[PDB]
Amino acid sequence: RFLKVKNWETDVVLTDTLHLKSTLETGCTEHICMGSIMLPTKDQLFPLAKEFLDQYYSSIKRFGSKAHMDRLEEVNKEIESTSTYQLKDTELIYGAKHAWRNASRCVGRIQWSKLQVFDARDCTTAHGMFNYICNHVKYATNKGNLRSAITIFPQRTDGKHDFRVWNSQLIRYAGYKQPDGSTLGDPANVQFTEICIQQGWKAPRGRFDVLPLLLQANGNDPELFQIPPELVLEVPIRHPKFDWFKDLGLKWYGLPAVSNMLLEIGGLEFSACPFSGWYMGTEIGVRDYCDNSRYNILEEVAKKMDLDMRKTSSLWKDQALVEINIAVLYSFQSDKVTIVDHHSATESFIKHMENEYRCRGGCPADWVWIVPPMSGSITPVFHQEMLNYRLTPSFEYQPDPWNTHVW
Amino acid sequence: RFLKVKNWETDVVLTDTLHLKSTLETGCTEHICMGSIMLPVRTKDQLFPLAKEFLDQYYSSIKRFGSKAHMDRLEEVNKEIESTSTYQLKDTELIYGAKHAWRNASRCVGRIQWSKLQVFDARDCTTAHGMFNYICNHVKYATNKGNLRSAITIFPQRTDGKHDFRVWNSQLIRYAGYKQPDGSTLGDPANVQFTEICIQQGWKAPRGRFDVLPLLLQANGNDPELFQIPPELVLEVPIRHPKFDWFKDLGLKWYGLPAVSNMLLEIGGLEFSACPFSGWYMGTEIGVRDYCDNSRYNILEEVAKKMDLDMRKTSSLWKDQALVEINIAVLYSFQSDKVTIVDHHSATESFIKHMENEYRCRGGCPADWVWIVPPMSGSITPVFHQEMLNYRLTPSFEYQPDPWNTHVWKG
C-alpha cells in the first residue's frame, strides 16, 4: 500500500503515498502490464468539483475554512441550476499548473509552477482564437528566451459547441505525398497538410513549409490563418565542426506547443488549451530528423561523414545520430533560442522527483517516455524506478476533430 | 477476449490471445503501473494443479493431448506426488521445460534462438566438486572456441528448501571488484560484496583489474565451496578500436560467454534453484552497461579525454560520442577474434521478426519494453516503436534472493 522506488545507481529509496490519491485507471491489470501502449451527467460533476476544490483550499492552507465551505456550496448550487460551473481565475491557474505537474510523461515538470496562464474563456470566434494564439506564440517565443505558457479557451458544454485547435502543434511543417511515392516534408503531417489544402491553403510545397492554423470555435466549421512569419522563430541547423552540414538545408522551429489535448480541471473539460515550453534537443535530433516515418536523414548524413554503411555493426546509424543531435544543440545555442539537452533535462527531473517525493509524497512518471530516445543508460533516469498513475487535473488525448465534428 | 498491439513505425497490428494463459500476477493494478520496478518449501495442495497444467501443455506441443500416454503420465505424477510429496520430470519434459522458460522470458531480446538450447541434465549431481565439473563442461561446450552455443545446466530441484543446490556467483564468469581504503575501487564495482565473500572463504585475490572470480558452489544445502575455473576454459577478448590506436592502451578486455547463474527455473511446480544458462552477448551489454554505467567500469571520462572532446558542457554530447566509440570497439574486437557477438540493430530486428511469428503461431509473445529496448540509440531500433504486452507464463525464470542472506551456516 505504501510503495518504494529505488534508484539502482544511487540506492536512494523513496516511498510513494501520492498514488493512493490516484483516481483514474491505467490500463494495466495484475494479469497484463500495458505500460508500453501509447493509448491504454450532473451526477458525476459535483464529486469531481469537490475533490478539486478540496485540494485547492488545501494548497493555500485554507482547508476547512469559511471560504472553502462557502465556495463548495456556491459551486454545488451552480451545478444544480446550470448543469455546469465556472472556475475562479485563481482556480484556473492552479488547475492548469497541476495538470502539468501531473503529466507523468513529461520530463520537464521541474518548471511546472512557472506557467503563464492566459485566460481566453471570453473567446467566441476563430478570429478571436487566432488573436489569442498569436499573443501566446509571441509571449512564449520572447525573442528566444522562451517562456512556458498555456491558453485556455472555453470549456465544453453540450459537446457540439467545442472549441478545438485542429493542428497537433501550433507550429509544424507541411507533409506532401508525391507522384514519386516518397514524401516531401514531414510525413507525420501528410493527412492534415491535406485537410488544409482541402480547405484552401496555397501550399508552397517545400521541405519546411509552416502550416496554417485551422481553428474551430463554438463547434463551427474551422478556418485557416497564417501565423505571421515574424512570430515563428526558426533555427538554421549547422554543425560546430562539419562544414557540409549547413548544405543539408535543415531548419527547425523554436516553439514546441502542443495544441490537440484536452485539459480536465475539477470535472470541467477544456478541449482547446494549446500549451508550450521549450525543446529537449533529442525531440528534434533523434525523433524529428532520424525517425523512420519522420524526416529520416541518417543515410544521407552518414554518407557525408563517409562511414562504413555496409554493416549495421559499424554503428554508423549511431554515429550519425550523435552528430545530428550535437548540431541541433549547437545551432539553437548559437542562435540564442532556449533548448535543453537530455543530460541536463533528465538530471533536473531526478531533482524534481526528489522534491515531489518530499513535498507531496510522490510524482507519477512514465519511464518509457521519461528516458530519452538516445543514450538511455547514461542519463540518470534510466536507473530510476518510477511509479505511474493518473492524477487530476490532467491533459488527456482526445479524438482528432475531423473524425468527429460533423462537417 | 483479444488484445491488439500496434507498431507505430510500420502500422502493423497484432492480436494477443496467449495472455489469457497468464495466472501469475504482474505487480500492476488498474490504479498503478509497476512496469519500471526491477522486482515487482512448497506443499502438496498446490502441486498437482501446476503439474497438470504443465503436462497438458507439454502433451499439446507433441500433438498427444488426451492420449493414453498423457492420461497415464498424469496418473503417474498424481501417485508420485501423494506418496513422496514431489515428482520427477522425464528428460523430454525437462528439455521442453527449459526451452519454454527461455521462450517465456519477457525481458529477453534474444528469444528467436529459444528452440536451440543445449540442455544438460545434472539432476544426478550430489556434491559441489560434482557441480564444478558439470559447470566446466558446460563452459567448454558453450564457448566452443569462440563459436558460442546456447546451453543450460540443471541441477537437482528443491526438496524441503533446506537442501538447495545454488551457484552463489551471479554469472559463471565475472571480474572481481575491490574497494580500497581510500574509497576508490579496483575492477568491477558490481562485484565487490561477492568478491568479499570469496576472499573471506579462502580465495587468494590477485587484486588486479580483471581477475576472474572463483565459483562458489552449494550442494544439497551444504556450505558452498571455492573452485577456480581453468583459465584455458575462460575465453577473453582484448578490447581495441579499428581507428583509435590509443584504445588498446586503456587495458580493457571482456569475457566472451555471458552466463546467468542465480536464477530459479520453474517447471510444473518444481523449483530448480541452480540452473546456470548461457548464450552470447549483444554488444551493448558490455559497451554501454559493463563499461559505461557510473556504477561499473565508468571509462567514459578516460575515453572522452583521449578523443579530445569538449568535456566542459554536457551539450557537447561528449558522453554520447565516447559511448558510441566504446561500442564500436567492443563489436570490432569480438568479430576480429571470431567470438560470437550481436549488435543491437541486428538483435532488435531479429526479435521483431521473432515476436511477429510468435503472435502468428502461438497467439502472443510477452515482452518487457523497458528491458527489450537497448540502452543506447533506443529510437533507431525497431523495438522502440513496437507496442508490447507484458505478462507471466510458466515455465519461467525467476529472480531469487541471494543465498548469503538466507543460508544457515554449518561450519
Ligand code: HEM
Ligand atoms: C519547459 C519545457 C518542457 C520540456 C523540456 C518538456 C519535456 C517533454 C518531453 C521531452 C516530452 C516527450 C515528448 C515526446 O517524446 O513525444 C514531453 C511530453 C509532455 N509534456 Fe512536457 N516539457 C516541457 C514543458 C511542458 C509544458 C509547459 C506542459 C504543459 C503545461 C507540458 C506537458 C506535457 C505533456 C502532457 C506531455 C505528454 C504529451 C503526450 O502524451 O504526447 N510540458 N514533455
Ligand code: HEM
Ligand atoms: C542467444 C543469446 C542471447 C542474447 C543475445 C540475449 C539477450 C539478452 C539481453 C541483452 C538481456 C538483458 C540483460 C540485461 O539487460 O541485464 C537478456 C535477458 C534475459 N535473457 Fe537473454 N539472451 C540470450 C540468451 C538467453 C538464454 C540461453 C536464456 C536462458 C535459456 C536467456 C534468458 C534470459 C532471461 C531470464 C533474461 C532476464 C534476466 C533478468 O531478469 O535479470 N537468454 N537477454
Ligand SMILES: Cc1cc(N)nc(C[C@@H]2CNC[C@@H]2OCCCCCc2cccc(F)c2)c1
Ligand atoms: C510543451 C512541450 C514541450 C516539449 N518539449 N515537448 C512537448 C510534447 C512533444 C512535442 N513534440 C512531440 C510531443 O507532442 C506530442 C506528440 C503526440 C504523441 C501522441 C499521439 C497521439 C495520437 C497519434 C499520434 F501519432 C501521437 C510539449
Ligand SMILES: Cc1cc(N)nc(C[C@@H]2CNC[C@@H]2OCCCCCc2cccc(F)c2)c1
Ligand atoms: C544468457 C544471456 C545472454 C545475454 N546476452 N545476456 C544475458 C543476461 C545478462 C548477461 N549479463 C548479466 C545479465 O543478467 C543480469 C544483469 C542485470 C540483472 C540485475 C537484476 C537485479 C534484480 C532482479 C533482476 F531480475 C535482475 C543472459
Ligand SMILES: C[C@H](O)[C@H](O)[C@H]1CNc2nc(N)[nH]c(=O)c2N1
Ligand atoms: C510503443 C511505445 O509505447 C511508443 O513508441 C513510445 C515509446 N516511448 C516514447 N517516448 C517518448 N518520449 N515519446 C514517444 O512518442 C514515445 N513513443
Ligand SMILES: C[C@H](O)[C@H](O)[C@H]1CNc2nc(N)[nH]c(=O)c2N1
Ligand atoms: C529502473 C529500471 O526498471 C531498471 O534500471 C532497468 C531499466 N531497463 C533495463 N534494461 C535492461 N536490458 N537491463 C537492465 O538492467 C535494465 N534496468
Ligand SMILES: [Zn+2]
Ligand atoms: Zn503496468
